[PDB]
Amino acid sequence: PRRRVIGQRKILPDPKFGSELLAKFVNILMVDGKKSTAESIVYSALETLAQRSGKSELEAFEVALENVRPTVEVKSRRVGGSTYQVPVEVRPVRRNALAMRWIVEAARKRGDKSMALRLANELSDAAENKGTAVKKREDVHRMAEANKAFA
Amino acid sequence: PVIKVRENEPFDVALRRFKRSCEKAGVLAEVRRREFYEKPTTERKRAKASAVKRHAKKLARENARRTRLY
Amino acid sequence: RKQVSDGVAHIHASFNNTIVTITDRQGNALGWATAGGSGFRGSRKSTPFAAQVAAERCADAVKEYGIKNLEVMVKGPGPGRESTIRALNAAGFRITNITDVTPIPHNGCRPPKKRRV
RNA sequence: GCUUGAGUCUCGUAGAGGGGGGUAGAAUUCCAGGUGUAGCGGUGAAAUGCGUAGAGAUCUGGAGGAAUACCGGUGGCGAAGGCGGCCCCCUGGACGAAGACUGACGCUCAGGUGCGAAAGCGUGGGGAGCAAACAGGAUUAGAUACCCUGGUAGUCCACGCCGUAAACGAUGUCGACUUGGAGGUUGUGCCCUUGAGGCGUGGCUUCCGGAGCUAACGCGUUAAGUCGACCGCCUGGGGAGUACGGCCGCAAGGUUAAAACUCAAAUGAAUUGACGGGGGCCCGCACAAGCGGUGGAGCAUGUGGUUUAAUUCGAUGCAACGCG
């Protein structure tokens, strides 16, 4: 805000295998404070994924997540009153949360028989680089490439 | 101005010495004055206004800014 | 496909556009590249990044000629010159020496009137 | 008569003081040529414009016109307007040193004469750049404006006219006297130049302040202090520096200069607020970062309108509208 820089919230880790990343993912994916429904969707999306790939659950989610990874962002600032968009190098902790947000935004569309089946389609479609979250990442990268004249 | 970068001299050294040459000569100020015609009124008023600002902060430097605040 | 070892780079930087022209030392050019020649239109034409990209395109404009080293002349004010000569050796060159050749009148001709906005 | 005011001469000095004539260098434009090629220019963004008939860039050369970077200065000179490369010719003034010489020759000045920025006018040249008018592109509700691309008179020269400016330190000229400090510029004397010094004395100038003055702001030895001499000018605001007449001018117009009528104020300086598309420093779910809504659908409820015999009354920008 205007003054503070206060310390971060510390959540409890992922129960099935201890990770902060999957606890952040179940917190992002949830709706109206329904933690149990969200973690059921996440688990039935990740155990049903590791047999599509072949590796185990966590690092398959990690290279489904790192393919959608924004290196840079755009921002809007002011120097002449002109107010253009200038690219910025993102911190990785907000890069990772923006990646999870884009994956969930992908999964809310492309409708089929489940939310977990939609996720297990989405993360594999991102992990072989043909999804729509990879389209969001390459559109962010394109909008920063076009605006590289300001740095 | 004229810079000749001789034997045993790196790149950014030479580039900074060229920038030092440009800031010694003041070529960009003398181009920036010659883009638009400032009237002789504006020239004399700029001269007098900058001079009264100059010495009117200078005598404040000399005796007004020498006494303590806290 | 005529060869010559050393030449002169002229980086004419205005406030709207930078033109890099690589000549020989007798003034005869070999090819040029501007800050508007590839993309980079309008407000993005005046930036130093456009001048860096212009130097990078004039670097490949003399791939046939095989230039070993060149002296770099700089004209005009604006966000041209330093980023241009810094990208000039980054695209691979030995800049021999640098001149600032911008025109200064001895009060020769009357400039246009000052803008109101 | 006298030398104290005013002047003359001898010696130097500093100076964009003035008039006439040359000449140099940088740059802009144009023309001719060489290399080379798809953009240039412009803007907040654009477009008009220029460009494949070869531009912009770049080099060699030519031709013109105008102004003189640096020095450059709260520096200098001039009565003011004003005056800025360098050299020469003609020429005005101011200042300093020590003397001499005339001996009140002085100060101010209505009418009069002269000079007097820029714009303008006449005649004859010249014309690079800039540029009223003008055109086109934008911006905009509109934009006969600001911004852009062009562009004519004009700006330049010679000779005449005009005779006005916020021609302003908004401060007439001359003389006398009255605490200080920091500087600048230009002479000059003395002491050991004993060392880039010191102690003096003259002219001009810049700032800050004391008494005093002033409505205050401020001015303050260069007075707006204390006085004297002469001149010009003012008498509420508007009408009005206007009309009519006169004089001047080629004209534009200048100068001189009312009245009827109308208002009870117009003004100056400062003060406390408020305001600013003024400045600086901050704060708030104010914005940003996010999550979820409302506006669309159906119903609930309140209001406005309309209706009605009555649709009781009140709240009705935030701060009324699931409110009393």
Curated annotation (Swiss-Prot), chain A:
Misc: The strain K12 sequence is shown. Has been predicted to contact the N-terminal domain of IF-3 based on footprint studies; exactly how IF-3 interacts with the 30S subunit is controversial.
UniProt keyword terms in alphabetical order: Ribonucleoprotein, Ribosomal protein, RNA-binding, rRNA-binding, tRNA-binding
GO MF annotation list: mRNA binding; rRNA binding; structural constituent of ribosome; tRNA binding
GO biological process terms, semicolon-separated: cytoplasmic translation; negative regulation of translation; ribosomal small subunit assembly; translation
CC terms in the record's Gene Ontology section: cytoplasm; cytosol; cytosolic small ribosomal subunit; membrane; ribosome
Name of the gene this protein is made from: rpsG
Family: Belongs to the universal ribosomal protein uS7 family.
Protein purpose: One of the primary rRNA binding proteins, it binds directly to 16S rRNA where it nucleates assembly of the head domain of the 30S subunit. Is located at the subunit interface close to the decoding center, where it has been shown to contact mRNA. Has been shown to contact tRNA in both the P and E sites; it probably blocks exit of the E site tRNA. Protein S7 is also a translational repressor protein; it regulates the expression of the str operon members to different degrees by binding to its mRNA.
Species of provenance: Escherichia coli (strain K12)
Subunit: Part of the 30S ribosomal subunit. Contacts proteins S9 and S11. Cross-links to IF3 and the P and E site tRNAs.
The protein, known as: Small ribosomal subunit protein uS7
Shown part of the complete sequence: 2 to 152 of 179
